[PDB]
């Protein structure tokens, strides 16, 4: 819903959050099609790291849920979610592993489709000092 905001001023990060979460949960709570449609627009005009994020997420999204594979294909063939720069390299790998390969690797790789690191709860202390400055 939050992603409905603003197409590319919303930043790399929100797109990365809806993208990461939609990838990882693999919505059956709402139809993933809204999520996908929202993320698809954001990627075009936002930074490399999210566009690369979007292909890899899609791949994991493929491995966790079979249903998803058709959307992965429309998104990845595009000049956006693949074939930009960084986005291409990751994509060539992620795509080829999903498309071409066994997906022993893809399957293994998704354990929920989790983040890259699990820290503590950083915000609250930061916030404590930061407010009366």
């Amino acid at each position: 819903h939050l992603c409905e905001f603003i197409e590319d001023c919303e930043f790399t990060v929100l797109a990365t959050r809806i993208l990461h979460l939609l990838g990882q949960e693999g919505p059956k709570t709402n139809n993933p099609s809204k999520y996908i449609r929202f993320i698809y627009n954001r990627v075009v005009l936002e930074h490399e790291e999210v566009r690369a994020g979007a292909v890899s997420a899609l791949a994991k999204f493929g491995a966790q849920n079979e249903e998803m594979l058709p959307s992965i294909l429309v998104l990845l063939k595009r000049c956006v979610m693949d074939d930009d720069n960084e986005v291409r390299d990751r994509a060539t790998f992620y795509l080829n592993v999903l498309e071409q390969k066994q997906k022993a690797l893809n399957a293994g790789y998704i354990l929920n489709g989790l983040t890259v690191s699990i820290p503590g709860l950083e915000k609250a202390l930061q916030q404590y000092t930061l407010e009366p400055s």
């Binding site: 994991k60 992620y94 690797l105 890259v116």
Partner: peptide
């Protein structure tokens, strides 16, 4: 690793045949 979805694991599994043109990273 970089943005949350990417992770290590795909490639870690990969390199079936150690960095060699076959069906590995090299292929890709």
């Amino acid at each position: 690793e970089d943005r949350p979805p990417l992770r290590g694991f795909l490639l870690d599994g990969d390199f079936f045949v150690a960095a060699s043109l076959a069906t590995t990273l090299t292929k890709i």
